Design a protein around this ligand. Structure first.
Ligand SMILES: [Mg+2]
Ligand SMILES: [Mg+2]
Ligand SMILES: [Mg+2]
Ligand SMILES: [Mg+2]
Ligand SMILES: [Mg+2]
Ligand SMILES: [Mg+2]
Ligand SMILES: [Mg+2]
Ligand SMILES: [Mg+2]
Ligand SMILES: [Mg+2]
Ligand SMILES: [Mg+2]
Ligand SMILES: [Mg+2]
Ligand SMILES: [Mg+2]
Ligand SMILES: [Mg+2]
Ligand SMILES: [Zn+2]
Lengths: 101, 213, 136, 49
RNA sequence: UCAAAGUUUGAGCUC
RNA sequence: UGACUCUAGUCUGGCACGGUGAAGAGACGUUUUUUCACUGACCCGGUGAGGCGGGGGGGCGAGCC
RNA sequence: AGACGGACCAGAGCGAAAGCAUUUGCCAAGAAUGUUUUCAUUAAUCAAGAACGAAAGUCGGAGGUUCGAAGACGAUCAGAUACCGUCGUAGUUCCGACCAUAAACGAUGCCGACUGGCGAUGCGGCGGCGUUAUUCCCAUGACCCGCCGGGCAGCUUCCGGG
């Protein structure tokens, strides 16, 4: 039986794409199938900045940022527990939740 | 049986006169022992300098490399070598849904300084825009790239190194570029993301000292 | 290791190059230039237990002890260049990275302007594994 | 050399065609013997480069 | 931010 | 040839041909010695041994009185 | 020195199909659109026959940076001639010669007609208050609200089928 309509990817008009090496593994995944995450993040996140802010000289001097873009492989994603399994019915709900988290 | 940092002799690092403050900082080299001169060891070093030190109270992301090609006397005389934008800033700027447009060009000024300039620009989402994309056409990008080179050559070739650095300190070039492109497609976050000194001419010390008093 | 500057009016800067890898931590103090070094010191000298040199507990303890010795040398301000392994390889600092970071938050050095400097390539050479990846 | 009689070569002779002695040899050696593989550091199927 | 976990009288299950 | 006894050749250290100066430790005003030069012995290569090194003066450009 | 042209990169485009993304120049082509342009049946599908056809493989050169079949060793393990590691050959790169095989998957042959919506989108075309640069208007550019052709996709329902 056909498990998913798109075969866990986004190949409808094209035909081929360049493979990527995993970060945690090196598993080769098609970029279009592969998970893409644009993580920008403070070199110091929240707990550290309060501690580190003590370490700064100037009162309120802005910190630069750490502009990452991550790609993981699948088995790593479930292991690292970024994504959960869903039901057959909920599967089609492809809208991501609002911006509460 | 001696602490080795005793041998080092210090030197004051001096900025040229177009800029306000002269003494950037201090640099150390071993004292004259043997063939080598502390001045000689000092002569090759390179100094990354902040915009807070260029503008009186301002953001840090512009930088200026400066090698001290000659030592005057208890000082280090720097020279223009290449502006650059910070990784944080450019990667922060660079976000999805916008035609990025870069261009480079090598060109030499009236004085014997040869530059290689790198521009950058991003298409602007309008206030009332409802199409999510806000992308440019390809012809639009080719037009921007050609104008980019026109303005950079025309501006730099016609005027001296002093003028090129005093225009680069503002956005005057990128601002005129925003002027040139505003009919075509509104881009906003305009910068000269890199400028690069390439081949200096023969050193005339009277010219260097005239720049330094 | 003597900055003749007056203490608070202005700072005599050094610049610490904090390498935090997933299996090592470097600390390399230099001058404004960088070409000339003042004191570099690593964890692997201070702690001999191969498995927990990069451990965050080790990297923290290391960062405190190292930052302590640089303060000892009496440099008041530092520029910072935190760095990770980089390249085609990882862009994420290893477990030592963050413990070291918090450690240097408590350690007390006057900090000049900070920046990130990990060398990302435009288009890279092939990552060290198979095509089928580091499998386990 | 192997084909020759054992006057014209140090590897000669024998009923069966064979060398009999090791083919690697010193360079501190007199003219007449310096024969074969001179100062052979290695000697085999050169695997790799 | 993944080292491993094998078998089970021949001596009678069932609309 | 793994017999005995020798030999040309080749490797290695010493003395002599074999100088003039530099810095350091010491060494057993002196050295044992480590480096750094110089050149006059000595050595090599090329040429039908053909314009070398200094000092003026002259000029094409850069900067000054 | 040789690979590679990130991020910009989309449920986007083009190509017979594999596939195709550093700048600039030269060469020619083409789907699609507008058209009161010419010819007036010149067309559709096809055994035989033919062009192209990722990777590995093969033969010569050129080149030999990285990785890395084979192989060795070092580790765990009852055994591991594997999964982990350090090396490391052919190959991986270019030119010139063969080859014609993949889950070559939409696992869905090509043309042609008809029968429900809905919003979004890419191109060409048309129409229409006003904003906004050219600035000093026009006519263009960016927005904006629509209609038209076909196009990659999406959602939707007792259409009916299965
Ligand atoms: Mg004989
Ligand atoms: Mg197992
Ligand atoms: Mg049994
Ligand atoms: Mg590139
Ligand atoms: Mg394919
Ligand atoms: Mg047929
Ligand atoms: Mg092939
Ligand atoms: Mg092939
Ligand atoms: Mg062959
Ligand atoms: Mg390998
Ligand atoms: Mg074994
Ligand atoms: Mg292996
Ligand atoms: Mg097939
Ligand atoms: Zn995975």
């Amino acid at each position: 039986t056909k498990k998913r309509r798109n075969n866990g990817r986004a190949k409808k008009g094209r035909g081929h794409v360049q493979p990527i090496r995993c970060t945690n593994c090196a598993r080769c995944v098609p970029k279009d199938k592969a998970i893409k995450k644009f993580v920008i993040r403070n070199i110091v996140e929240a707990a550290a900045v309060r501690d580190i802010s003590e370490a700064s000289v100037f009162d309120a001097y802005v910190l630069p940022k750490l502009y990452v873009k991550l790609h993981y492989c699948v088995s790593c994603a479930i292991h690292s527990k970024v994504v959960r399994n869903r039901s057959r019915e909920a599967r089609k709900d492809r809208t991501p939740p609002p911006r509460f988290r | 049986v001696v602490d080795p940092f005793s041998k080092k002799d210090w030197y004051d690092v001096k900025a040229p006169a177009m800029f306000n403050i002269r003494n950037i900082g201090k640099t150390l080299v071993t004292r004259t022992q043997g063939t080598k001169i502390a001045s000689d060891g000092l002569k090759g070093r390179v100094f990354e300098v902040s915009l807070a030190d260029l503008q009186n109270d301002e953001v840090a992301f512009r930088k200026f490399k400066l090698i001290t090609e000659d030592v005057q006397g208890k000082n280090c005389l720097t020279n223009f070598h290449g502006m650059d934008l910070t990784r944080d800033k450019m990667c922060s700027m660079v976000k999805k849904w916008q035609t990025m447009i870069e261009a480079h060009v090598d060109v030499k000024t009236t004085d014997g300084y040869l530059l290689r300039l790198f521009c950058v620009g991003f298409t602007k989402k309008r206030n009332n825009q409802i199409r999510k994309t806000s992308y440019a056409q390809h012809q639009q990008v080719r037009q921007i790239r050609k104008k980019m080179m026109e303005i950079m050559t025309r501006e730099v070739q016609t005027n001296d190194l002093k003028e090129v650095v005093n225009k680069l300190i503002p956005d005057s070039i990128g601002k005129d570029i925003e002027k040139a492109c505003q009919s075509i497609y509104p881009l906003h976050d305009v910068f000269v993301r890199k400028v690069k000194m390439l081949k200096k001419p023969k050193f005339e010390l009277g010219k260097l000292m005239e720049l330094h008093g | 290791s003597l900055g003749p500057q007056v203490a608070e009016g202005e700072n005599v800067f050094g610049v610490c190059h904090i390498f935090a890898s997933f299996n090592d931590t470097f600390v390399h103090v230099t001058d404004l230039s960088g070409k000339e070094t003042i004191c570099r010191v690593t964890g692997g000298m201070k702690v001999k237990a191969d498995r927990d040199e990069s451990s965050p507990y080790a990297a923290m303890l290391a960062a405190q002890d190292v930052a302590q010795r640089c303060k000892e040398l009496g440099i008041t301000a530092l520029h910072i260049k935190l760095r990770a392994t980089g390249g085609n390889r990882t862009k994420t600092p290893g477990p030592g990275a963050q413990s070291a970071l918090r450690a240097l938050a408590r350690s007390g050095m006057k900090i000049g302007r900070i920046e990130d400097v990990t060398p990302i390539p435009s288009d890279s050479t092939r990552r060290k594994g198979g095509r089928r990846g580091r499998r386990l | 050399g192997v084909a020759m009689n054992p006057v014209e070569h140090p590897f000669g002779g024998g009923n069966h065609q064979h060398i009999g002695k090791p083919s690697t040899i010193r360079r501190d050696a007199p003219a007449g013997r310096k024969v074969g593989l001179i100062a052979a550091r290695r000697t085999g199927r050169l695997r790799g480069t």
